[PDB]
Each structure stands twice: as structure tokens, then as C-alpha cells.
Design a protein around this ligand. Structure first.
Ligand code: HEM
Ligand code: HEM
Lengths: 137, 137
């Protein structure tokens, strides 16, 4: 289930984080505009950049904490507030998060690993609801 | 599901409130000691007492407000806090609430009406957790 999936991801985090983030950027290439120096590069070029794996791991480290602090796939309001108020997220709207979770769920469904993808879809829905409640446009 | 159950209950709030409250007292007769004016009175006698229908409906009204405000059966901490801080609840512990939810779920399962009983159980569990976090003993 969802709780065990958090442990699965955490056990191989850099690999999952990079592969899910790449699935996101490839499904939605114009999302690269929110980042520096990602356009014009293949997956392997991205993975060999100095900061790519590091920043995506820090991403997913926090995502897994948000998932872990949730009850029944409902994130804490304080975690949602942190995500809204982060300077690095000042250009974002809930649509960015929605697209990330569409890609995340798709990745999980296609994976060989028994992820509980329906729970991840619910968690994404609930996180987006929480971001809205916290004042993300 | 849970949302429909809120509508079902709200549709005939007085009747459901009284029925469930009596089911609670019948399963856990010692809980009547918290309601000193209900000691030694038949169900019909209780129904003749203005405050029995009034307070019981108002309790279940607040229960329905808390249920409706929940996300996936996870209640707001602010709602748990309201329940803990009520002067009328100053002598209670989380065990009293646990018993209420056991009886409510039992009532739902026994009823002809088609309730999402598993969800009310989970809501009860999540509310008890939240009561404890808000300082109920
Ligand atoms: C639950 C989902 C998300 C979490 C937990 C999260 C968390 C984080 C964290 C921890 C950082 C700091 C990384 C660092 O500087 O080392 C970060 C940076 C950043 N985030 Fe997010 N984020 C999420 C969703 C998103 C989405 C959906 C977007 C855009 C589509 C996004 C855009 C950015 C950008 C542009 C930065 C700074 C630039 C960069 O690190 O490359 N974030 N995020
Ligand atoms: C989620 C569950 C509960 C909710 C939403 C709730 C809500 C309320 C409300 C709104 C009142 C005010 C009634 C009024 O004065 O008009 C009340 C009173 C009261 N509650 Fe609760 N309550 C809950 C659980 C319990 C439990 C489990 C007990 C004890 C077993 C309890 C004992 C009392 C007592 C003794 C009063 C005052 C006397 C009375 O109104 O009959 N409550 N509650």
C-alpha cells in the first residue's frame, strides 16, 4: 500500500526521483521553463548535470516526508503551506502539481514495482486541494 | 459513500441522532451517568423531554459539520479542538468517543439504510487520534 510505497521509494530514492522527474518533463516538456539549463538535453545528459540528481532528490525527500506525515493520504496543512510559500515555488499554480501527479501515477502503473497507484492519485488530489486551501492559485 | 451518509443522516437528523444516541447508551449503559437527567427514564419519556431531542440533535449536527469538513475521513484539528475544549466535555476521555463510534458503526451495519460503515469507523479512529493530539486524556 501507500505507506509501504514510501519505504520502497526511500530505499532507492535518487533512482526513483530522477526517473519520475524525467517522466514528468518528457510528458510535459514546456514545464522545463520553470527550471534552468534543462532544455536541449536528453535524459542521460540531464542525469550527468551537476545539480539534476541532487535537486530532484531533495524534491522527492520532502515529497516522501509529506506523504509519510499524511493520514489516509491527506497531507498536513502545514506541509501544504510550506510548499506554497517556498520562494522556489513562487511561479507555480496547482496545475503544475496536477501534471506532476498525472506523470507520477502513470509511471507507477507502468512500473514492474506493485505500487498502489490509486493511493498516489488520491494523495496528489488531496495535496492539490491542500495547496488551494493554503492559497496557491 | 460517506458524503451520501451525511445527507442521509441530515435528512432526518432528529430521528437518527436519537436512534444512534440510544444505541450508544444501550451498548454501553454506564455512559448514561454523564447525562444525569436521563437516568431512570424510558425511551418514550426521554423523547418527551425538550432537551433530549434538542441536545442530541445539536450534538449530531456538529458531528455532521465535522464529518463534512473532513478530507477522506480525516477531521480538522480545529474541529477536534472544539470538542476537547467544550465545558460539557471536560470530564470525558477518548474512550468515551471510541465507545460512541463502536455503537454508531454497529447501528449502521444493523440498519436496513445503506451506510459506508467502514468509513465511519475510520472517521471515528481519526477523530480519536485528533482528540488525543488536542489534549483529551
Ligand atoms: C509535492 C511536490 C513538490 C515538492 C515536495 C517540492 C519540493 C522542493 C524542494 C525541497 C526544493 C528545493 C530543491 C533544492 O534547491 O535543492 C524545490 C525546488 C524547486 N521546485 Fe519543487 N517541489 C514540488 C513540486 C514542484 C513542481 C510541480 C514544480 C514545477 C512544475 C516545482 C518547481 C521547483 C523549482 C523550479 C525549484 C527550484 C529550482 C530547482 O531546484 O531546480 N516543484 N522543490
Ligand atoms: C463527535 C462526537 C460528539 C459531538 C460532535 C458532540 C457535540 C456536542 C454538542 C454540540 C453539545 C451541545 C448540546 C447543547 O447543549 O445543545 C454537546 C453536549 C454534551 N455532550 Fe457531546 N459531543 C460528542 C460526543 C460526546 C460523548 C462521546 C459524550 C459522553 C459519552 C458526550 C457528552 C456530552 C454531554 C454530557 C453534554 C451536555 C449534556 C447534554 O447536552 O445532554 N459528548 N456535545
Amino acid at each position: 500500500g501507500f505507506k509501504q510505497d514510501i519505504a520502497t521509494i526511500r530505499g532507492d530514492l535518487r533512482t526513483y526521483a530522477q526517473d519520475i522527474f524525467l517522466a514528468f518533463l518528457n510528458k510535459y516538456p514546456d514545464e522545463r521553463r520553470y527550471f534552468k539549463n534543462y532544455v536541449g538535453k536528453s535524459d542521460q545528459e540531464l542525469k550527468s548535470m551537476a545539480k539534476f540528481g541532487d535537486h530532484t532528490e531533495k524534491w522527492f525527500n520532502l515529497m516522501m516526508e509529506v506523504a509519510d506525515r499524511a493520514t489516509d493520504c491527506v497531507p498536513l496543512a502545514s506541509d501544504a503551506n510550506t510548499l506554497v510559500q517556498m520562494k522556489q515555488h513562487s511561479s507555480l499554480t496547482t496545475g503544475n502539481f496536477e501534471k506532476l501527479f498525472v506523470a507520477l501515477v502513470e509511471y507507477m502503473r507502468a512500473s514492474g514495482q506493485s505500487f498502489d497507484s490509486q493511493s498516489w492519485d488520491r494523495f496528489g488530489k488531496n495535496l492539490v486541494s491542500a495547496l488551494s486551501s493554503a492559497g496557491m492559485k
